[PDB]
Design a protein around this ligand. Sequence first.
Ligand SMILES: CN(C)CC(=O)Nc1ccc2[nH]c(=O)c3ccccc3c2c1
Length: 135
Amino acid sequence: EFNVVPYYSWFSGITQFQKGKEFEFVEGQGVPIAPGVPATEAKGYWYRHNRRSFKTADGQRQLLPRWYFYYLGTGPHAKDQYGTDIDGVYWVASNQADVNTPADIVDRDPSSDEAIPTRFPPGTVLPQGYYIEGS
Ligand SMILES: CN(C)CC(=O)Nc1ccc2[nH]c(=O)c3ccccc3c2c1
């Protein structure tokens, strides 16, 4: 969880379960499906939530990262330039998207909307070592 309120993603998270496997998508893929959004707005980034646990007194490690998707110009990196090398950020965009203008899309009031469970179109190459939440 969090003890500082996050920007909330329109979608469910993707969670690492195998250490050492990278988070990635093929260029053009990796934008989660949202009913009615045009491919020109299908642009943004996945953002890594580092999680950390507590020591139990039986010794006991691991609580891997979970990634959350944010449309370009929103989220904790609402200001950065698409593409920019930033630890913990992975940019993705449909090939119809112009990544020079922010997506025209409001954040998600977590109280007047649940997260849309994360799906991808047929053919999307899923990152091995990750489990899509809600699936
Ligand atoms: C290292 N952490 C401070 C980063 C952070 O927690 N990121 C974070 C950032 C994005 C998050 N997006 C969500 O949709 C969400 C939903 C339920 C609970 C948490 C989140 C959520 C959390």
